[PDB]
Ligand binder design. Structure first.
Ligand SMILES: NC(=O)c1ccc[n+]([C@@H]2O[C@H](COP(=O)([O-])OP(=O)(O)OC[C@H]3O[C@@H](n4cnc5c(N)ncnc54)[C@H](O)[C@@H]3O)[C@@H](O)[C@H]2O)c1
Ligand SMILES: NC(=O)c1ccc[n+]([C@@H]2O[C@H](COP(=O)([O-])OP(=O)(O)OC[C@H]3O[C@@H](n4cnc5c(N)ncnc54)[C@H](O)[C@@H]3O)[C@@H](O)[C@H]2O)c1
Lengths: 332, 332, 332, 332
């Protein structure tokens, strides 16, 4: 599939990188009114957390040339004015974080785009999580959402645990690496006061609808999950801490077994499994949506257990956006 | 009561700092075979996380003089060889971390010390948590433990929640600040492989018996609590994340009501309460053992909730060591 | 003197904090379109790096009440609209960082303000550095600049070294703490690309005109100094690294003696002096503009030396803004 | 050439990694009487700063098998006892940081090894810096030193600048990333009080003989260089800040010209050159010994300049240890 990407931020750049490192889709256009061609070369080439881009990045003839492939560049604030159709872009990845509504994201279709994938939760667009409910997608859906990075980490795990033991209720906490929405020093945040406090100095409590969203991709869990988060001073990689009450008795060993089996089969590449003495950095640039940490979790009894799963909030999610588009194309 | 302190590390120094700013407890002797008199002046005077000491510190005639009070300095590696008696130390704070058992801490009694307070969990010494079970102490106890910093944060909260609603079962996680036990860069730790990884770069999973210990200071909770921890790159101040099942239905507001009332009454100074948009640094040098964060927590339903409480793992605990000694002296 | 402050950011808030601590000036008005009254209470009360404000802060009948004194709050986006005169503000501290020109800062005059102090370098407004050239100010100056935090650290030191030994030429490097202008993760920064890279992960080279500016407050040094900077992942406190060649031979002990005498006399409170084994945190909330670190520096020979001086980039500078206004008032 | 490595710390592991990542040499033995075979697999496989090993690491029959190549493991505490001879270890990399002297390091020769390379400065062993004085090595030298990481960064640059313009005198400052020698929180380090202070919280001044050592690999510069360092909270990658006086007038562009040609010719792979807007992370895992940052430096005049050069203190140096051995082998 030929793809267009709106917004060249962390998500836009990593989705583009994933498209190229994996070769699964072909990026032929990028739109960003604030980042010009030459700056794009720089931002895509050098990455503090994921390293310098493996391949080539040059600006040739007004176009961004990555690994030899020329990419048309646009500078439109209003997506409706982006000529995706002329660039040959069939699918458009909406990653600005500003057009997450069915209506706003629809603006891309007015330029030639056949379909739009919102790289963020949507209030009305149907949300999908690879490995959990992506087969519920059909050709009538012109605008879809790939949910959030945290939802993509919890949903795969929640599905396995619920199918095998039945989740009566659960509460999650995600210890999250600092994000771009945060501030370097105590600054104005207006909406969320705690988010304005110095990121590198604090452990910051924050709200998140990721746990509740899992009830949307896994209907049986609707109303049985919710949680919150703590933003901590690490550049990348976060972890889900799921405390849940199980319906059927489950020894910790059986939980490991069931998850391991899932990571080697139906959820391979999506849900990972490890028993090694890992730490956050061991998952930097890891493409999994969620990686179960056997040794980190702990059970109180056969019905009350705390499960731990890692996720490169940047890389994993970006790869799922590409995997979602591949699945969609196979349904055309 | 005249006090002696063994080990001049973070706790030894902060307990001494807490003592001098307090009043009724006097430090008259300090032992540390690794830190010489002049180095002690430096380490006690300058503190990266708590600021320069407010008062005077000097090296005079071989003694450490703080705020004018001369302190006898010892350099024994064997606690059995410390002459606490000659120096006048009735109570000895055992804070090295390598003499936590009854059999080892008793050594201080050879030099004349009358009672020994272990500033850490003990495998056999009776453990106490101010505000929770300190009333259980009696004059026959010559060696006691003040438990851990994390246990001192969870116990006060657990007591209030259990007294009013009944904790059926709970699982905690403590997002914990960096400790002197970790390494600056990936280094050796043959016992706990994960703790050897770069502290500033990672979110590090770790085991902790703090939750299980609460079942020791609150017998009714024995076997109903356990948890683990995540070490993150912040210099000080940690937070307890308690997910528990309640027996009696409890609206979040009722929980707020009850906790707040406890902090203004029986647990004043021990358990704090706030509804402000706080972050970890707001508890820097806070002397509370635990401070309930009303806005950070969240409930799934009237019987399943996640409670959040802050604690300056260094300052709070150090002040409780002093408070424990004051209580003991009042029972002599 | 009745003072008004525009912009309630790190400096606006710290200048206000500095003002209340010592009744040198009375803040009677504040303006900031991005921070409403209630948010101001929060931002001023809680400070990650300098601690909770010691005193009281509340929102009463539409005014910000600090330590009892009620403060008129304005929310004008345009400086000209701000009715400084009405509220009773003689001097106005221009700390937004956007109106640093003579032309722009003059707008405060159109509102009733008598004098205007720009808390940042100015392209045309006369710049002053307490202890170095503040004696050059006169009643005809309605708009002045207090230079930069780095210039205030280097100038005092440069003056003493030049007065006694003569600086033939010098090059400085300032290892700087992070500022509100940096990003938490690799993000866009059109004018300064390096400044867009993750602040907590990198040592970031940056340009600075602070060294060249010293030639402006000390005319004899015009064209004899320049330098650059390295932004590093520390919340606050920076250090100047001055490498200079001397005209008159100077043993290192002579440099120490000369700096020590200056800090105890004419530059007391401005230029500090220490021989202790200090690190950056030992200067947190230190009100000096520059503190000479005797043990940190090193000389190659009697004419080529490297001098080290610390400065709390936030606190020191904020106090100098207040000291500058006090001096101005004494000249009215 | 077959190699043995004594010490499996940061240096030992990265030298081993470099050996396989290049294939210039072949590691056949590792001696570390403090790290168990299974722990070695873990420490070599997972690396916080350089990522998971891009290969294979098992533990087949008492040996460490990397990329399908078996390595004999030793737990000998006295180098003399190691059987380098039987294993086929022609050269031994002494990287413990303990056996640095000509005699302590000599302990390896008895074990059957032909030559010993000390991965650290030596008080009496001849020191070499690839690209600067490695041609001075001859077959009579059984024990050699590869100097320090900082010396390997400054020497290449100093050689080029001195060769073309003549360095009259210079003073350097190295802004250094966090090292193992440091402590996570204020701890004991009696020799150097400042090195014991919390690494993640401070900018720590430290002494370094790297600048003076350049006078030993470049004799003409003996006594013309010295400097110091600042430890900052970054995991890896450091930068040299060289302020020097030139004999021959040199415009900044002439310096760029000369350094660039040197990086494309005689010093290719050793001295790098860039004009891009780089930051520390852009040099993570960079194998150069030193990379000139054109845009970061600044000149006061044609005879006084500040030159900036980056170096991955871990990776660059480790690769030079391998390059030194390759050169030695070619002289056999
Ligand atoms: N700081 C915290 O977060 C905290 C709070 C709860 C409990 N604790 C407990 O406090 C104890 C120490 O922690 P800390 O942070 O002060 O550690 P440090 O900061 O490790 O302090 C320990 C001190 O013990 C001294 N020491 C070592 N061996 C000795 C010996 N043989 N004789 C005499 N002195 C000796 C050291 O020189 C050092 O100054 C541990 O048992 C720990 O579990 C720590
Ligand atoms: N913190 C330092 O290191 C430091 C010390 C020396 C000088 N300075 C100078 O101080 C100034 C501000 O720096 P800071 O760190 O406090 O920044 P912030 O921390 O960016 O503070 C600026 C404040 O200005 C307000 N503001 C923005 N637009 C405005 C408008 N149109 N009208 C009124 N208020 C507006 C913001 O809401 C914000 O609170 C800059 O010019 C900077 O160069 C900084």
């Amino acid at each position: 599939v030929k793809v267009g990407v709106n917004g060249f931020g962390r998500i836009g750049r990593l989705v583009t990188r994933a498209a190229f490192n994996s070769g699964k889709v072909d990026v032929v256009a990028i739109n960003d009114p604030f980042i010009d061609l030459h700056y794009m070369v720089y931002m895509f080439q050098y990455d503090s957390t994921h390293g310098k881009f493996h391949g080539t990045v040059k600006a040739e003839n007004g176009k961004l040339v990555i690994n030899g492939k020329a990419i048309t560049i646009f500078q439109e604030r209003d997506p409706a004015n982006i000529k995706w159709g002329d660039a040959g872009a069939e699918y458009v990845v909406e990653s600005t974080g500003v057009f997450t509504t069915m209506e706003k994201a629809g603006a891309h279709l007015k330029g030639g785009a056949k379909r739009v994938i919102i790289s963020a939760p949507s209030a009305d667009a149907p949300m999908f999580v690879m490995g959990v409910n992506h087969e519920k997608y059909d050709n009538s859906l012109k605008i879809v959402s790939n949910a959030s990075c945290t939802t993509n980490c919890l949903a795969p795990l929640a599905k396995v645990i619920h199918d095998h033991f039945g989740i009566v209720e659960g509460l999650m906490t995600t210890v999250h690496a600092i994000t771009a929405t945060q501030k370097t020093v105590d600054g104005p945040s207006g909406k969320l006061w705690r988010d304005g406090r110095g990121a590198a100095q604090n452990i910051i409590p924050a709200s998140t609808g990721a746990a509740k969203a899992v009830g949307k991709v896994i209907p049986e869990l609707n109303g049985k999950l919710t949680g919150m988060a703590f933003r901590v001073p690490t550049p990348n990689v976060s972890v889900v801490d799921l405390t849940c009450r199980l319906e059927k008795a489950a020894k910790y060993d059986d939980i490991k077994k069931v998850v391991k089996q899932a990571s080697e089969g139906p959820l391979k590449g999506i849900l990972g499994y490890t028993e090694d003495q890992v730490v956050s950095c061991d998952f930097n640039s890891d493409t999994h949506s969620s990686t179960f940490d056997a040794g980190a979790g702990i059970a109180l009894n056969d019905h009350f257990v705390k499960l731990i799963s890692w996720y490169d909030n940047e890389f994993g999610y970006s790869n799922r956006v590409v995997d979602l588009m591949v699945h969609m194309a196979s349904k055309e």
